Amino acid sequence: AIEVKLANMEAEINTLKSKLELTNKLHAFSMGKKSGKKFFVTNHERMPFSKVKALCSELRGTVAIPRNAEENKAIQEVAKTSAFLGITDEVTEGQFMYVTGGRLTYSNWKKDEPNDVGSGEDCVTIVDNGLWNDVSCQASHTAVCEFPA
Amino acid sequence: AIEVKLANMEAEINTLKSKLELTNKLHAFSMGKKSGKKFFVTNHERMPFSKVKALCSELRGTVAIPRNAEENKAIQEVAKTSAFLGITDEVTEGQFMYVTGGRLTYSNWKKDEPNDVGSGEDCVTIVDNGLWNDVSCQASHTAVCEFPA
Amino acid sequence: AIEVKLANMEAEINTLKSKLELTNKLHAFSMGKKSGKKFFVTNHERMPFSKVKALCSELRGTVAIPRNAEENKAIQEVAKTSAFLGITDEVTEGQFMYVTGGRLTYSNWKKDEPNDVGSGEDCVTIVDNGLWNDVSCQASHTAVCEFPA
Numbered sequence: 370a371i372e373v374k375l376a377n378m379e380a381e382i383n384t385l386k387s388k389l390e391l392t393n394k395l396h397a398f399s400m401g402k403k404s405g406k407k408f409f410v411t412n413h414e415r416m417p418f419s420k421v422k423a424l425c426s427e428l429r430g431t432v433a434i435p436r437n438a439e440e441n442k443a444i445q446e447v448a449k450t451s452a453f454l455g456i457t458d459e460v461t462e463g464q465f466m467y468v469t470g471g472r473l474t475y476s477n478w479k480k481d482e483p484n485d486v487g488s489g490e491d492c493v494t495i496v497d498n499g500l501w502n503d504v505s506c507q508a509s510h511t512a513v514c515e516f517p518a
Numbered sequence: 519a520i521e522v523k524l525a526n527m528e529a530e531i532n533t534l535k536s537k538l539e540l541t542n543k544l545h546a547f548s549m550g551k552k553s554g555k556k557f558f559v560t561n562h563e564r565m566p567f568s569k570v571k572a573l574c575s576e577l578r579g580t581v582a583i584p585r586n587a588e589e590n591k592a593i594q595e596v597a598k599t600s601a602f603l604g605i606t607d608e609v610t611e612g613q614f615m616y617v618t619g620g621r622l623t624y625s626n627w628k629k630d631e632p633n634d635v636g637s638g639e640d641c642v643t644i645v646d647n648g649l650w651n652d653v654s655c656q657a658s659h660t661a662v663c664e665f666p667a
Numbered sequence: 668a669i670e671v672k673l674a675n676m677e678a679e680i681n682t683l684k685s686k687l688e689l690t691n692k693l694h695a696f697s698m699g700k701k702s703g704k705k706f707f708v709t710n711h712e713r714m715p716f717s718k719v720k721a722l723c724s725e726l727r728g729t730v731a732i733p734r735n736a737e738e739n740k741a742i743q744e745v746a747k748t749s750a751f752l753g754i755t756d757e758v759t760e761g762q763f764m765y766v767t768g769g770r771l772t773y774s775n776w777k778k779d780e781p782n783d784v785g786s787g788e789d790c791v792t793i794v795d796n797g798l799w800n801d802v803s804c805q806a807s808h809t810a811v812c813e814f815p816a
């Protein structure tokens with residue numbers, strides 16, 4: 370009977386795993402995830418870049434990254450205020466790279482930016498109208514995470 | 519060892535079932551579900567009717583169907599823009615049925631609607647008024663899913 | 668082999684426990700939970716105090732309790748209307764206590780409140796502007812639950 374109980378339990382587990390996946394899909398849906406698109410979410414908390422990266426990492430997501438105008442607008446409507454994007458030029462000044470790998474393709478810089486102000490600005494925030502401004506990674510901005518499509 | 523381990527994993531499984539049930543109750547509450555009332559949810563995406571049904575079906579819900587004046591208003595409250603209802607006359611033109619089966623009971627059609635205008639209209643949408651209008655199941659309108667009371 | 672399958676089941680269970688914890692963390696985050704702080708949620712339903720206690724209790728939370736001005740404003744923003752707080756003087760008239768134990772410290776009473784009006788008022792509501800007013804526990808106000816930091 371032991372092997373039977375085990376098989377029945379593996380069946381329960383398979384069912385439970387599917388149920389949890391459904392819970393995740395309904396949650397993503399209720400928070401705006403569009404079909405076939407990445408899911409963007411925020412708690413409206415402002416913190417230094419390293420903390421945003423750590424936070425999204427803990428949720429198994431990454432710092433929000435706009436790969437085109439549509440995604441940029443999506444992030445813009447989720448944030449409501451200045452928010453960090455998963456982009457920095459920490460390696461080579463002026464060479465923005467995604468924190469998940471690869472050179473920046475789509476960009477939406479504000480007039481006169483990036484300007485690597487004062488002691489330097491190697492992080493990026495999306496601001497008003499959805500435009501971009503480089504800022505200090507130590508500055509506190511809104512944490513917005515993204516999850517895969 | 520073996521039998522005690524198996525017995526404990528059965529209890530772990532049941533504990534996980536209880537927690538997931540609790541998680542689902544909390545999510546429904548946060549989504550606005552009122553006690554002993556069905557609730558509606560949307561990701562604010564606009565799409566063809568066939569996609570709305572498939573999407574809600576996957577989430578184990580159905581395309582929102584107002585059974586009375588109250589519910590019809592709750593959906594309107596959630597949608598905010600034209601949204602598909604789980605009603606169509608695809609089977610027999612003129613005869614609208616619920617996607618869940620059965621013939622129409624309560625309704626709230628707009629004046630001189632449904633009319634099956636143009637090349638035809640077999641789906642139904644709730645407008646920024648609560649009134650209903652048949653439209654092309656191919657047109658794109660907001661997806662609003664409904665879940666059991 | 669039996670022992671192999673059992674060890675796999677343990678791994679599956681531990682994986683499921685991890686994923687559910689992540690689902691809970693992401694949901695809290697999506698609900699505005701700030702790092703190291705408790706969060707608040709409401710379904711916007713109005714009901715007597717005993718019903719709110721039972722509802723929050725079931726979700727493994729408690730009726731919202733503002734411990735300082737920051738928390739008070741967060742609860743105010745979530746409520747958007749009059750809502751019960753986890754504070755009452757049901758046990759000893761005039762001495763407000765937290766439903767979870769302990770005498771009231773931080774408070775935000777409107778002028779001339781609390782006043783135990785009429786036959787008496789032993790519960791507390793936060794109002795539109797964030798100030799507090801004692802009311803009848805039998806009155807119906809918005810249900811707002813709080814969850815631990």
Ligand SMILES: OC[C@H]1O[C@H](O[C@@H]2[C@H](O)[C@@H](O)O[C@H](CO)[C@H]2O)[C@@H](O)[C@@H](O)[C@@H]1O
Pocket residue numbers: 482484486490502503504505
């Ligand atoms: O050093 C931060 C930032 O300062 C300046 O931009 C300002 C900020 O974006 C924020 O305060 O909003 C202001 C009004 O829109 C804006 O001037 C610039 O020097 C910018 O380059 C710099 O990163």
Ligand SMILES: OC[C@H]1O[C@H](O[C@@H]2[C@H](O)[C@@H](O)O[C@H](CO)[C@H]2O)[C@@H](O)[C@@H](O)[C@@H]1O
Pocket residue numbers: 631633635636639651652653654
């Ligand atoms: O074919 C769609 C629909 O078109 C006409 O109604 C219009 C639509 O409901 C929508 O575009 O909003 C318009 C006003 O805001 C409205 O006139 C009608 O021909 C209707 O019968 C038809 O279903």
Ligand SMILES: OC[C@H]1O[C@H](O[C@@H]2[C@H](O)[C@@H](O)O[C@H](CO)[C@H]2O)[C@@H](O)[C@@H](O)[C@@H]1O
Pocket residue numbers: 780782784788800801802
């Ligand atoms: O705002 C004061 C008081 O208002 C409500 O009670 C009412 C007042 O005592 C007064 O208007 O008389 C009414 C009965 O005639 C009574 O309901 C309550 O909200 C109370 O809690 C509050 O202190």
Ligand SMILES: [Ca+2]
Pocket residue numbers: 458459461462489490491
């Ligand atoms: Ca630099």
Ligand SMILES: [Ca+2]
Pocket residue numbers: 458462463485489490491492503
């Ligand atoms: Ca720089």
Ligand SMILES: [Ca+2]
Pocket residue numbers: 482483484485486490502503504
């Ligand atoms: Ca700058």
Ligand SMILES: [Ca+2]
Pocket residue numbers: 607608610611638639640
């Ligand atoms: Ca037809």
Ligand SMILES: [Ca+2]
Pocket residue numbers: 607611612634638639640641652
């Ligand atoms: Ca038709």
Ligand SMILES: [Ca+2]
Pocket residue numbers: 631632633634635639651652653
């Ligand atoms: Ca029509």
Ligand SMILES: [Ca+2]
Pocket residue numbers: 756757759760761787788789
């Ligand atoms: Ca009393």
Ligand SMILES: [Ca+2]
Pocket residue numbers: 756760761783787788789790801
């Ligand atoms: Ca009293």
Ligand SMILES: [Ca+2]
Pocket residue numbers: 780781782783784788800801802
């Ligand atoms: Ca009072």
Ligand SMILES: [Cl-]
Pocket residue numbers: 489490491492504505506507
């Ligand atoms: Cl920097």
Ligand SMILES: [Cl-]
Pocket residue numbers: 638639640641653654655656
């Ligand atoms: Cl059609």
Ligand SMILES: [Cl-]
Pocket residue numbers: 787788789790802803804805
């Ligand atoms: Cl009372």
